[PDB]
Design a protein around this ligand. Structure first.
Ligand SMILES: CCCCCCCCCCC[C@@H](O)CC(=O)N[C@H]1[C@@H](OP(=O)(O)O)O[C@H](CO)[C@@H](O)[C@@H]1OC(=O)C[C@H](O)CCCCCCCCCCC
Length: 240
């Protein structure tokens, strides 16, 4: 079996989420063939060179699971798109680009964090285009660590202000983007996070049924999607 999680937003000041995650690693990820983390694993990331004691300890916990034979893949989200090779080497995980198509029990399956689908959120689309611009990444990594933390706090503050003001239809995925990107990748299954609305959505692509599975965020309870050759299930579990 294979596990999918996202939107944990791990941080030092949420030990309840950390405890749930570490229990999940021991109880479920150790026995899985693979674990996919589809973005926003951490609350924020300023670059691997800024990793703190807490973040290093999370890397070590992943490494224990990877060394047991579980393959771990990590995809960027909007909080942690600066995770690099140094972190993944310490964690024993593989960095997966957004988007990625994997083979899952013989079916091609598209994986994304999900924010790139939110094309009606024009203010966010503009921010994303600027944040991911190679010129932006260049200047950002030339900022001192403390100044990077300052700008990360400022972005979080403005995001918290602005997201409260937006309608749910503006911040959720644009419906017609889903068949468009799934057709382009030749898949009938898409798995993503970001939107915090765990669900499975049936849809049509060119007269053929397809599905979009949305992973849950861990703010109030943990979530995991588990797939094996016979079926799949997403279910929550309590934070510790
Ligand atoms: C190198 C270190 C520093 C730089 C890199 C740091 C990386 C870590 C920081 C993460 C910030 C991230 O939270 C921003 C973001 O992604 N917001 C969108 C997201 O909301 P979340 O709050 O992340 O859950 O998802 C929401 C739903 O999709 C969406 O709504 C939010 O997007 C916004 O709210 C964006 C606003 O609409 C526009 C904000 C522009 C802010 C400009 C601030 C800079 C000040 C400029 C002064 C001239």
């Amino acid at each position: 079996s294979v596990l999918f999680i996202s939107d944990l937003h791990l941080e030092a000041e949420r030990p309840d989420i950390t405890r749930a995650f570490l229990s999940f690693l021991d109880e479920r990820a150790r026995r899985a063939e693979a674990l996919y983390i589809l973005g926003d694993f951490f609350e924020a990331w300023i670059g691997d060179d800024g990793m703190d004691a807490f973040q290093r300890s999370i890397a070590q916990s992943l490494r224990q699971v990877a060394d047991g034979g579980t393959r771990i893949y990590l995809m960027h989200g909007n909080r942690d798109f600066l995770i690099g090779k140094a972190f993944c080497r310490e964690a024993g995980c593989t960095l997966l680009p957004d988007p990625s198509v994997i083979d899952l029990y013989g079916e091609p399956v598209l994986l994304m964090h999900g924010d790139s689908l939110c094309t009606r959120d024009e203010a966010y689309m503009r921010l994303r285009r600027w944040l991911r611009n190679p010129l932006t990444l260049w200047v950002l990594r030339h900022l001192p660590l403390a100044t990077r933390h300052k700008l990360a706090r400022k972005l979080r503050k403005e995001s918290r202000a602005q997201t409260r003001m937006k309608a749910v239809d503006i911040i959720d995925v644009t419906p017609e983007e889903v068949p468009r990107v799934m057709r382009g990748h030749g898949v009938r299954t898409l798995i993503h996070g970001h939107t915090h609305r765990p669900a499975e959505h049936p849809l049509d692509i060119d007269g053929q049924p397809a599905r979009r599975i949305v992973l849950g965020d861990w703010d109030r309870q943990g979530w995991a999607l588990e797939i094996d050759a016979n079926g799949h299930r997403q279910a929550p579990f309590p934070l510790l």
